[PDB]
Scaffold this active site. Structure first.
Site, PDB file in Angstrom:
ATOM      1  N   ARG A   6       0.821  -1.195   0.000  1.00  0.00           N
ATOM      2  CA  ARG A   6       0.000   0.000   0.000  1.00  0.00           C
ATOM      3  C   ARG A   6       0.859   1.249   0.000  1.00  0.00           C
ATOM      4  O   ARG A   6       0.484   2.258  -0.586  1.00  0.00           O
ATOM      5  CB  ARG A   6      -0.965   0.014   1.177  1.00  0.00           C
ATOM      6  CG  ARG A   6      -2.105  -0.957   1.018  1.00  0.00           C
ATOM      7  CD  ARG A   6      -3.290  -0.520   1.853  1.00  0.00           C
ATOM      8  NE  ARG A   6      -3.037  -0.638   3.282  1.00  0.00           N
ATOM      9  CZ  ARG A   6      -3.873  -0.217   4.222  1.00  0.00           C
ATOM     10  NH1 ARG A   6      -5.023   0.361   3.880  1.00  0.00           N
ATOM     11  NH2 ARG A   6      -3.558  -0.371   5.502  1.00  0.00           N
ATOM     12  N   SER A  64     -14.878   8.607   1.730  1.00  0.00           N
ATOM     13  CA  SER A  64     -16.016   7.711   1.740  1.00  0.00           C
ATOM     14  C   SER A  64     -15.983   6.799   2.957  1.00  0.00           C
ATOM     15  O   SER A  64     -16.993   6.218   3.317  1.00  0.00           O
ATOM     16  CB  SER A  64     -16.070   6.896   0.442  1.00  0.00           C
ATOM     17  OG  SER A  64     -15.009   5.944   0.408  1.00  0.00           O
ATOM     18  N   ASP A  73     -19.429  -0.349   4.209  1.00  0.00           N
ATOM     19  CA  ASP A  73     -19.420  -1.486   5.117  1.00  0.00           C
ATOM     20  C   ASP A  73     -20.387  -1.280   6.298  1.00  0.00           C
ATOM     21  O   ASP A  73     -21.143  -2.173   6.691  1.00  0.00           O
ATOM     22  CB  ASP A  73     -17.995  -1.748   5.601  1.00  0.00           C
ATOM     23  CG  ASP A  73     -17.139  -2.466   4.541  1.00  0.00           C
ATOM     24  OD1 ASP A  73     -17.594  -2.587   3.378  1.00  0.00           O
ATOM     25  OD2 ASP A  73     -16.011  -2.920   4.862  1.00  0.00           O
ATOM     26  N   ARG A 100     -23.981  -1.777   4.988  1.00  0.00           N
ATOM     27  CA  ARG A 100     -24.252  -3.192   4.782  1.00  0.00           C
ATOM     28  C   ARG A 100     -24.406  -3.911   6.127  1.00  0.00           C
ATOM     29  O   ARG A 100     -25.306  -4.730   6.296  1.00  0.00           O
ATOM     30  CB  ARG A 100     -23.157  -3.850   3.941  1.00  0.00           C
ATOM     31  CG  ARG A 100     -23.564  -5.213   3.432  1.00  0.00           C
ATOM     32  CD  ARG A 100     -22.534  -5.856   2.510  1.00  0.00           C
ATOM     33  NE  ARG A 100     -23.092  -7.063   1.904  1.00  0.00           N
ATOM     34  CZ  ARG A 100     -22.643  -8.298   2.122  1.00  0.00           C
ATOM     35  NH1 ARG A 100     -21.600  -8.511   2.918  1.00  0.00           N
ATOM     36  NH2 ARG A 100     -23.232  -9.329   1.528  1.00  0.00           N
ATOM     37  N   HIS A 125     -10.812   2.118   6.479  1.00  0.00           N
ATOM     38  CA  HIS A 125     -11.508   1.386   5.434  1.00  0.00           C
ATOM     39  C   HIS A 125     -10.662   0.180   4.987  1.00  0.00           C
ATOM     40  O   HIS A 125      -9.758   0.310   4.172  1.00  0.00           O
ATOM     41  CB  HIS A 125     -11.793   2.317   4.268  1.00  0.00           C
ATOM     42  CG  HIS A 125     -12.446   1.639   3.116  1.00  0.00           C
ATOM     43  ND1 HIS A 125     -13.477   0.734   3.277  1.00  0.00           N
ATOM     44  CD2 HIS A 125     -12.208   1.715   1.785  1.00  0.00           C
ATOM     45  CE1 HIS A 125     -13.851   0.291   2.090  1.00  0.00           C
ATOM     46  NE2 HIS A 125     -13.098   0.873   1.169  1.00  0.00           N
TER      47      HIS A 125
END
Ligand SMILES: NC(=O)c1ccc[n+]([C@@H]2O[C@H](COP(=O)([O-])OP(=O)(O)OC[C@H]3O[C@@H](n4cnc5c(N)ncnc54)[C@H](O)[C@@H]3O)[C@@H](O)[C@H]2O)c1
Ligand SMILES: NC(=O)c1ccc[n+]([C@@H]2O[C@H](COP(=O)([O-])OP(=O)(O)OC[C@H]3O[C@@H](n4cnc5c(N)ncnc54)[C@H](O)[C@@H]3O)[C@@H](O)[C@H]2O)c1
Lengths: 314, 312, 314, 312
Positions: free
Chosen positions: C90, C145, C150, C153, C177
């Protein structure tokens, strides 16, 4: 009634008519039938409501009819009844309204009706219980407006106060629709944060700003009535809201009048508690774990209702 | 960011229902209610706010006075004189002109300059008067006109021929009242004129379309006959006009409009298809009236102008 | 600017296009401009989106433009960026996306833009922080965001599981996230009834059914990617939702990426916590009182983000 | 209580976008997705369900197989043959007929007894075919036709003349393609025919609105030049047609309809304004075509019938 929802409204005074106007303005039902022995006022209203149907978001078919026209209704909403005279006690009022409701429920059942009842007439928890007795329907299919209006106002007031959306604020008013209704502070939470924490970690948030918000919620009707003679826009909106949760199978939690059967330590009484509302009526009852203060307030509230039911029902 | 504001003058049956319709429909952001009878207006605002939490869109409703009009996008006038059931006074229009004179003065004095929307009867007369008393441009004084009647008509026909009202064109023009008239020459279902469907079919008899017009013209009288007043239908038409204004719809409505010889008439407010948007009247659509209709229309425009001069 | 909302979208790949389609189908914005150096694909989509504007609930003006066209935008939504290659860390991805964002943010600031940034590109919390630094804007006006998708949901599963409406269910996923995001069980409640109570007083409500709902939320993207090759519909919906809370001034509580300095024991990091979102951006930060376990999970989550920021920022 | 259900066959660009549009608009209660490529359909259903919490209305979306069509109110076909770069084959209509043959027989064999909605190209041909392979009443097989192209047209015209599209009649009929044609004779704005507005003004001229038609006819080709395929616009039109069906709108739409000599054409599916409701096609608007339009139309219907006979 396979691809279309129908509402039968019994009683076309201020509440009933404003309720009808609300269903039409919000596009909640496909058909509405208005039932009222005062034929000139009620046909007048039906005609007035049809006059502007072209401007409603969805076409609504509105008619004047009688009990036989309930056969295929999904919902029957009763706003009919005598009104509480000054110097008259609630038991005296209930005696008159039980007689009226006995005739109404009887005739509706004989039409072939097999839907949900929604009761608006005062005292609502009492008349909701009676409509259950008179109808023989399952208790899940008889619903009263309960403390829905006061709750929602309580919940909005706070939402303005702590600065979140209502969808994010939890605040219930429960118990008898009237003076013994109580706030469930122990479970009030903004965006998930209990009110008690929000208060202690802040002096921009103070209990009295809250304990008076409650006193103002409980007197709202009385102040409206004092300045204008009667209250009916709020009641109409709360009924439209309940009707929507039913016709559209939303599973919304609303503090409608609900039959209790041991929960909260109350038995054999309809009373305002948070309940899931859908196309089948009551789907479930939220059991809040009340603290000691609230539990006593609630049993008292259930008590004043049983005191009124007892002379009238075994 | 702009916040839409409506000021309502007169909280009677029409005014109150108009308000409730705005709240149920989520049409405006703010609404102020003004009435000479302050206690009724206060009480009504409280009732309307009682169920506020159930409204689809948040709407700030408040009691106000004339000065609260300053920044109103729209001022809606639903105030008017009571009938004295005795002095039928085919005039009495005098009673109302005095009311509107005083009312318009107070709102202009506040600093207001948005749009007027007039509902009180006789709507065409009082719309002309409001323009005069206010000195605003003609495109910013608007009357409810024959919008209601055209809308009944148009929908009552989407039933008859079996289409969505969205697809069925039909207007009613002229003075709002007895001398108003249908525009049969431009009535069409789908892209197909009405006369075509009339002859090429007898599921569509030509007298059945005729009676529908009598219903539309007499609907209000019949409601009044039973209930004493009409308000729900009117309130709906007003909320619709307000919506075309506040949301810049550019939608065509037969509102009371000022005419510039456009239908062989001028110096008169009268019901005609005008395009409506945030600036008010944005255009007047000009139908090619057949000779029967020109007769009816100018006779109608004559009737109005007649009652006018005596006061102007 | 005064009577109309405008959204500038930077990056017209799967996410960006689906997001645009979502804004159009939902009637959320009045205007949309699409910005992308891949001119043919992006004008293709603009032309495609305009082809059917007649069927949208609201007329919406869509165009192809570049940074100068951001001057009057209310929101700039950034979906552009390199995508995480297999075997790439990352921190290697961030090095690439920081260079890209440096150019994008610089150019939109120079156009005159003075609205809100909404950041969608991965790693979203890192790039939201960078966009804050690069822009010089107040931290309330740079929004990522976050765990927003998640969370929702998570809060829908339970909604279907305990049988109430989502608006009545409280459940947040917070943190980074990604894999270190945590459920806040301590504050999960239905109608106001803590989940832990609901588990005990029943056993149609067991624990593992709950813990697995979490494990499945965490893996949802991975499984979509297995079967489909990529994920973008859900992301687009979550972005449209955030956009709507902003353009319509809703004060919705959403777990967007939000700047913390002190809250939850975290300093100088953007991370997913529940925050009130309105027309001015972040209006307030809900501070949940996490239990011992959650507090440790959260600071670990804030920690893996600071580990990535540190090599790139003071 | 009835639950509206849609079965979608083909989760490519068009099918996938159609699905996302249904979910975003809250049009159906349930949706099933079917595709030969099982993995793609599973993945898409998963992606579409990922953001379910954000949908305005609850919608159950599922992966499915042909048997799941039994209860479906509507079956939408967005499946088809690939280009083939190789032999341009003005045929390949052959490639697709073979596909529909297998698809239609599979759905009929499930017990399906709803409405077909066909999107694949050439839409008119494949709509005719679907009616043959299914043996359903012709009113229950519907093609997207020229709905998209008419709707654009109607819209560009509401801008040009400055009204809401709601009151701006204008259709495009014929085969979906090059031989399609504008019905200028009944094009009208607010009640007023277009020709009236063209001559009676020079803010409006008949080469301005001559090119508006070419933009409409070539829009799809231009999107295809740039991006490789069109889907967003098509998906919007399909969701709209689905909405008129599921919500019993009686909306007039230029879908692919079977003609009974009704425009001088017979035994052909072709684009004309038809009333659409829960039963499918409920009527066919009979526009009084001028002679130019009769020529174009029957030429358009000829071109189609001709492609049909070799497979009749
Ligand atoms: N069908 C009908 O409703 C009906 C029938 C015939 C005529 N009208 C006319 O239309 C008007 C509105 O109809 P309605 O039924 O709502 O009447 P209404 O009597 O219920 O209400 C009229 C309101 O206007 C208010 N008002 C009077 N003078 C005012 C002033 N100068 N400033 C501010 N407010 C003032 C009154 O207080 C009253 O609340 C009537 O007053 C009447 O002139 C109505
Ligand atoms: N503008 C356009 O999108 C475009 C251009 C030219 C032609 N077409 C035609 O329209 C069709 C659909 O357009 P698209 O862009 O979505 O194409 P697409 O390739 O993206 O999708 C077509 C889908 O149909 C599926 N399919 C094929 N046979 C099937 C069957 N027997 N049963 C179930 N599913 C089957 C494929 O697996 C594929 O997922 C194309 O296949 C083509 O024939 C479309």
């Amino acid at each position: 009634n396979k691809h279309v929802n129908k509402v039968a409204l019994i009683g076309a005074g201020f509440v009933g008519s404003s309720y009808a106007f609300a269903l039409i303005n919000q596009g909640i039902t496909d058909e509405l039938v208005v039932i009222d022995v005062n034929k000139e006022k009620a046909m007048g209203d039906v005609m007035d409501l049809n006059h502007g149907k072209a401007f409603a978001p969805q076409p609504v078919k509105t008619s004047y009819g009688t009990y036989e026209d309930c056969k295929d209704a999904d919902i029957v909403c009763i706003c009919a009844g005598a009104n509480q005279k000054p110097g008259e006690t609630r038991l005296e009022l209930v005696e008159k309204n039980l007689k009226i409701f006995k005739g109404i429920v009887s005739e509706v059942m004989a039409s072939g009706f097999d839907g949900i009842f929604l009761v608006a007439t005062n005292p609502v928890d009492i008349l909701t219980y009676a409509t259950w007795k008179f109808s023989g329907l399952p208790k899940e299919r008889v619903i009263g407006s309960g403390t829905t209006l006061d709750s929602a106002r309580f919940r909005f007031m706070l939402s303005e106060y702590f600065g979140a959306a209502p969808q994010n604020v939890c605040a219930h008013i429960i118990g008898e629709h009237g003076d013994t209704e109580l706030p469930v502070w122990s479970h009030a939470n903004v965006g998930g944060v209990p009110v008690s924490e929000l208060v202690e970690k802040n002096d921009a948030y103070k209990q009295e700003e809250l304990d008076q918000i409650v006193d103002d919620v409980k007197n709202a009707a009385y102040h409206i009535i004092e300045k204008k003679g009667a209250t009916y826009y709020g009641v109409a909106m709360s009924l439209a809201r309940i009707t929507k949760a039913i016709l559209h199978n939303e599973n919304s939690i609303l503090t409608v009048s609900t039959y209790l059967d041991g929960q909260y330590g109350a038995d054999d009484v309809y009373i305002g508690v948070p309940a899931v509302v859908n196309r089948g009526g009551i789907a479930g009852i939220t059991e809040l774990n009340l603290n000691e203060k609230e539990k006593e307030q609630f049993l008292h509230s259930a008590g004043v209702l049983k005191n009124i039911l007892k002379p009238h029902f075994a």
